[PDB]
From Swiss-Prot:
Comment block on domains: Avian ovomucoid consists of three homologous, tandem Kazal family inhibitory domains.
Any single GO CC term annotated in Swiss-Prot or TrEMBL for this entry: extracellular space
An MF annotation (GO) of this entry: serine-type endopeptidase inhibitor activity
Occurrences of domain Kazal-like (ranges): 4-54
Keywords from the named record: Disulfide bond, Glycoprotein, Protease inhibitor, Repeat, Secreted, Serine protease inhibitor
Organism whose genome encodes this protein: Lophura nycthemera (Silver pheasant)
The protein's name: Ovomucoid
Any Pfam family hit: Kazal_1
Tree of life domain: Eukaryota
Upper taxonomic lineage: Eukaryota, Metazoa, Chordata, Craniata, Vertebrata
Length: 54
């Protein structure tokens, strides 16, 4: 329902951004780079739970 604009994805590489994203799958991410990509790889099987670390 909310995953920020992931149109620039997939990316050719992720940055060291330390943005913790708690995917709706009860998982933690390193940043929106791993969230939009994990979203372009799952084909949409990944959602968001709360921009932060769970």
């Amino acid at each position: 329902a909310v995953s920020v604009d992931c149109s620039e994805y997939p990316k050719p590489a992720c940055t060291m951004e330390y943005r913790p994203l708690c995917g709706s799958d009860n998982k933690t991410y390193g940043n929106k780079c791993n969230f939009c990509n994990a979203v372009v790889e799952s084909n949409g099987t990944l959602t968001l739970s709360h921009f932060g670390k769970c």
